[PDB]
Amino acid sequence: AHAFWSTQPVPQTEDETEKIVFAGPMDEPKTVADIPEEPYPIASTFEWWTPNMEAADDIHAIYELLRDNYVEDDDSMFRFNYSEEFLQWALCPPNYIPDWHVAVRRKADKKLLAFIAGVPVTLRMGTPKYMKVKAQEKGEGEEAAKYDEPRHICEINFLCVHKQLREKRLAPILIKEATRRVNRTNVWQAVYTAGVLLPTPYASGQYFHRSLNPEKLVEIRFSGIPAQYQKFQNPMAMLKRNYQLPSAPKNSGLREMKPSDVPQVRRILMNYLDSFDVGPVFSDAEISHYLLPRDGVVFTYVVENDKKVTDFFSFYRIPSTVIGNSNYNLLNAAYVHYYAATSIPLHQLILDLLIVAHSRGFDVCNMVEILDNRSFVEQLKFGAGDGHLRYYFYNWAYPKIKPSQVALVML
Numbered sequence: 352a353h354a355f356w357s358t359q360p361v362p363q364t365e366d367e368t369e370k371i372v373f374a375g376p377m378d379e380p381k382t383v384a385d386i387p388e389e390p391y392p393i394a395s396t397f398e399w400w401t402p403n404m405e406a407a408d409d410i411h412a413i414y415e416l417l418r419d420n421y422v423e424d425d426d427s428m429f430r431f432n433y434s435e436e437f438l439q440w441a442l443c444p445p446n447y448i449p450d451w452h453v454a455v456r457r458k459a460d461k462k463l464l465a466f467i468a469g470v471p472v473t474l475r476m477g478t479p480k481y482m483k484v485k486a487q488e489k490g491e492g493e494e495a496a497k498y499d500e501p502r503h504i505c506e507i508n509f510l511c512v513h514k515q516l517r518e519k520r521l522a523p524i525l526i527k528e529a530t531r532r533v534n535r536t537n538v539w540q541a542v543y544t545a546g547v548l549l550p551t552p553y554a555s556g557q558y559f560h561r562s563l564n565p566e567k568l569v570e571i572r573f574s575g576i577p578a579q580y581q582k583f584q585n586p587m588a589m590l591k592r593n594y595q596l597p598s599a600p601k602n603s604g605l606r607e608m609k610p611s612d613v614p615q616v617r618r619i620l621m622n623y624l625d626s627f628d629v630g631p632v633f634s635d636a637e638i639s640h641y642l643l644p645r646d647g648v649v650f651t652y653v654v655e656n657d658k659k660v661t662d663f664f665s666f667y668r669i670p671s672t673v674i675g676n677s678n679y680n681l682l683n684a685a686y687v688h689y690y691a692a693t694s695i696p697l698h699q700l701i702l703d704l705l706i707v708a709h710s711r712g713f714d715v716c717n718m719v720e721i722l723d724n725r726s727f728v729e730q731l732k733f734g735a736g737d738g739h740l741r742y743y744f745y746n747w748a749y750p751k752i753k754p755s756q757v758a759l760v761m762l
């Protein structure tokens with residue numbers, strides 16, 4: 352079945368994943384000094400390249416590769432169009448390792464053919480709550496607790512092979528070279544996500560979509576006028592009315608996040624995320640980086656009561672190219688990012704996210720059913736789409752968990 356993934360330290364089947372009762376590594380313990388110091392062999396017409404990520408042409412080259420060759424929906428109607436500013440943000444968090452950004456170029460002309468990115472993340476990835484209970488029952492609490500400490504690992508994103516090089520076994524070479532560069536820095540696990548099923552996810556959830564500009568979504572066939580609307584004399588205007596939103600936020604204490612909010616947002620986010628089995632731990636510099644507003648990229652608002660931050664929400668922007676429509680080239684999507692509510696119901700916090708996104712010209716708001724996102728689906732009129740996001744670890748056995756026990760938002 353899997354000539355590459357059968358050779359890797361990952362659970363090989365659902366049945367095997369069903370058998371896992373404790374968190375912990377899969378592979379032989381190794382040491383840095385055992386890992387090759389030379390780059391993995393590659394054919395003589397290609398070369399490895401480490402882009403500099405904060406330098407504009409290098410970001411542009413990766414931008415072009417992903418604009419033309421990154422993920423599409425299953426019908427090849429939309430392709431992500433991550434911006435250059437978004438990629439500089441996502442790939443350069445505090446203390447990022449430049450060497451974990453890996454590219455293949457054609458040696459002759461320096462054409463970018465393939466890319467993968469790794470960034471640091473500190474992740475809680477110890478045995479989950481339901482499995483710690485069974486451990487107590489059986490007198491196995493010490494082994495269930497062994498890997499409780501948050502670990503400094505690699506978060507992978509943006510794997511892409513140019514369309515002309517597909518199914519030539521180039522993705523395994525890129526994945527082995529990234530693994531080598533991460534292991535040479537004494538890091539032995541990774542976390543990654545994909546829309547496709549690979550061996551073997553520890554969690555899976557559907558995507559949900561909240562229509563903000565239904566007339567455009569219908570015109571570009573992102574959504575339709577649903578068959579039920581045919582009972583109406585005028586199906587589209589009913590649909591506009593259905594999804595209409597206030598022109599201004601309803602929580603009076605809401606404002607954009609500023610730098611002096613960082614310690615309070617860190618505190619309330621960290622305390623909220625402790626309720627999930629798998630989630631990130633962020634320093635003040637990582638809260639600053641991932642949450643302070645950046646135009647066109649990330650948008651963050653706080654609710655301030657009596658000069659204290661009591662709630663906040665964030666969303667990020669990823670446009671998609673619309674492949675072939677005569678009226679529109681781009682789908683402007685907002686994605687639910689981190690949030691925490693302590694003074695109001697979550698639905699009432701996230702209604703203001705929808706309000707602000709619509710005010711700023713977003714067409715749809717998207718999310719996976721991680722965090723407590725299911726708690727506001729029905730009242731805020733999100734509907735399930737056709738895709739899923741699957742969560743995976745490299746070199747980590749982990750019991751299957753529900754997606755509502757996952758607190759890591761992937762960009």
Ligand SMILES: CCCCCCCCCCCCCC(=O)SCCNC(=O)CCNC(=O)[C@H](O)C(C)(C)COP(=O)(O)OP(=O)(O)OC[C@H]1O[C@@H](n2cnc3c(N)ncnc32)[C@H](O)[C@@H]1OP(=O)(O)O
Pocket residue numbers: 352353354355356357420421422423505507508509510511512513516517518519520521522523526529530533534538539540541543544545546547549745746
């Ligand atoms: C400790 C540090 C560890 C660091 C690394 C941790 C692991 C990170 C792992 C990567 C996480 C990435 C997270 C994301 O970014 S998920 C998004 C991935 N990108 C896209 O979908 C963009 C469009 N497609 C492509 O660019 C190509 O189709 C890709 C690059 C996906 C595959 O190229 P191609 O189609 O030309 O195929 P090949 O002949 O070269 O290679 C075939 C082999 O590739 C296996 N395959 C197919 N799709 C994926 C996939 N999404 N993750 C992992 N493996 C995948 C496949 O099962 C087969 O192996 P096996 O079935 O024969 O065994």
Ligand SMILES: NCCCC[C@H](NC(=O)[C@H](CO)NC(=O)CCCCCCCCCO)C(=O)NCCC1CCCCC1
Pocket residue numbers: 422423424425426428507508509543544545546558559560561562572573574575733734735736737738739740761
């Ligand atoms: N195939 C035809 C177009 C479907 C468009 C949309 N689907 C997605 O965007 C899907 C997600 O659903 N996207 C994809 O499948 C592509 C991405 C999948 C994940 C890739 C992640 C890579 C991660 C790297 O770390 C969708 O279903 N829209 C329906 C909206 C509707 C609004 C009214 C209420 C009901 C819903």
Ligand SMILES: [Mg+2]
Pocket residue numbers: 512516517518519520521522
């Ligand atoms: Mg290939």
